[PDB]
Symmetry: C2
């Protein structure tokens, strides 16, 4: 039964009067409508036993009532005090409101207190996070579209680097984001990374206007937003023939990531999935250089639940989405990472990106 009926069940169980939801991502997940309120006010109000209302600026009202359903919509003009309009549409005794503690600024809560009195505010964010851990088949299709665009990014990026003739890290970044803009993509899901040689072992490194080094490795970490959903992936290639040491580090990381991918299925635990990759790299003598958890969740944002880390005994179940991204980073010498995100099926998993994992030579 619907997300809205789940939130309304929460309110009765905890004896809270209504919500006032403000985050534009949450608003899109819950209503289907992507709204950019910027400076003005917009809120979603859900009750224990009454029709949910949706309060927007006067200009967005008609757009909103063609592209949502089940909602009671009304608005306000710059000539009005918005909290007075809201007050004129709620005629009950409000003594508690559920809001999102990390998003709602002081002006909104004070403006709200000025009408309904001395409110007791309750945090709604933990329940929203929990509803997002399991994805529907409809959600997984959209994330598959974002994955296809991440695969095109690699082909364009490898080809741009192989032309040499003075090409730099920033030159390659710009060319990649040029092609995505041409195909209609609205933005990247995080800052695009292209790092040459020893520069790939720095955890704070950033693409700059430095020429890529011959006979060294090149790291690409990238991702896009499409239809409100995200993608994330990493691949490490070679520019000319590398030396024997750097090719052996790449083999270790490669086999470690494929072993975690052949192990994931419902019934195992997050701790166990981290351990497959980490034990393999530790047994080979490079444990002190794999210094972060194996993976993180993904969905509308690039960083959600669950956490694939030690000490987490959560049971993996069908529908979850998360990243699988081991690495070895050795300062001044070399750094390598290989990354996919995936979704969990009834007897296994499938990955969102398909580009080759081997050490290709350009």
């Amino acid at each position: 039964m619907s997300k809205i009926e789940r939130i309304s069940a929460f309110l009765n169980d905890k004896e809270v009067d209504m919500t006032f939801i403000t985050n534009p991502t949450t608003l899109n997940y819950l209503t289907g409508l992507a709204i950019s309120p910027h400076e003005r006010i917009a809120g979603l109000m859900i009750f224990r036993d009454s029709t949910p209302m949706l309060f927007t600026p006067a200009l967005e009202v008609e757009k909103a009532k063609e592209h949502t359903s089940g909602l009671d919509i009304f608005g306000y003009e710059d000539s009005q005090n918005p909290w007075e309009v809201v007050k004129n549409h709620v005629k009950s005794d409000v003594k508690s409101i559920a809001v999102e503690f990390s998003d709602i600024p002081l002006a909104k809560t004070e403006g709200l207190k000025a009408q309904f009195g001395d409110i007791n505010f309750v945090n709604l964010t933990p329940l929203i996070e929990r509803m997002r851990l399991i994805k529907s088949a409809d959600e997984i299709e959209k994330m598959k579209v974002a994955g296809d665009f991440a695969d095109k990014c690699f082909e364009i990026g490898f080809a741009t680097a192989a032309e040499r003739n003075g090409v730099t890290e920033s030159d390659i970044v710009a060319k990649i984001e040029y092609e995505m803009k041409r195909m209609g993509v609205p933005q990247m899901s995080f800052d695009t990374l292209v790092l040459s040689g020893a520069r790939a072992a720095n955890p704070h490194g950033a693409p700059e206007n430095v020429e890529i080094q011959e006979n060294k490795l090149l790291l690409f970490d990238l991702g896009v937003m499409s239809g409100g959903y995200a993608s994330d992936a990493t691949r490490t290639i070679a520019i000319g023939q590398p030396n024997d040491f750097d090719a052996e580090i790449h083999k270790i990381v490669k086999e470690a990531q494929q072993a975690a991918m052949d192990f994931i299925k419902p019934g195992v635990t997050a701790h166990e999935v981290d351990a497959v990759a980490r034990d393999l790299i530790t047994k080979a003598g490079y444990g002190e250089y794999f210094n972060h958890r194996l993976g993180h969740g993904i969905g509308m944002d690039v960083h959600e639940y669950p956490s694939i880390v030690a000490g987490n005994d959560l049971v993996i179940q069908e529908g979850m989405c998360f990243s699988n991204e081991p690495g070895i980073y050795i300062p001044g010498k070399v750094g390598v990472r290989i990354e996919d995100c995936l979704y969990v099926t009834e007897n296994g998993c499938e990955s969102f990106t398909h580009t080759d994992h081997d050490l290709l030579i350009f």
Copy 2:
């Protein structure tokens, strides 16, 4: 008054004990420290008669003394509770705090209340907007740098559309932003607009993957961020030879804009600046199709003060920075806008951009 002296005199006049300033653009504006703190806590604290203090995360502590002087800097470890460090470091009594009411979220004012008690909060933002309304000489150099980048975008945009061969509005936008990226520009200051023929008359049109039209006009509205400051301009050209109706509409807009630039100087009012261009368009027979104010302010953002609009009797002063952008939009037929931003000198004004204003044919 230095900027710090100005905040503190405010506190003595209003009987407030101290500040907790949190927005990173404000932080940069007041001290020269530009940091991106994500979810960790940073705060600037000024007093009525006592040395200012600055609270940052344990990382940023010594990159903070790189860029600031005269401030007692100190930090906190991820294993610590930040508001506790703040409470044990402030050894005077606090019952009231000045903050930025639009920026500071609920979790942070509740974190402060649990350490200091029942705080009375007071809004500092009206004062920052009054300090930002007049620009210093150093601020104007940086805005000129951002304006030159906008002239370079026009050179690139005209050339790309001259090539024809099926090029579209969205092809043209991608090439503009590609080139800015290669030069190290962090981002644009708003969504770039390229609109062809009758599509420029839509008040809500947007670049799309459709071929530009021969023998019609083409509109370019664009700007960048550089060094923490913004820019904004518009030009309108022709693709092939235009018709006589569209060329006379361009001439009317050209003269209206140039007329307002020769009028602006200290002493006149904002209402009078709007009327100079508006009367010219009205007397030529198209007043019904000039349906927005003549300009807005510019600085760190593109949406600040003063407002150039009927009814605003504010007096213009040396050092104010605003836009000058009349236009005519006739549904189904044509749209033209021409736009510069400017700074007011001791006896006139000067423009931030220099690209030609005439109707050029590519």
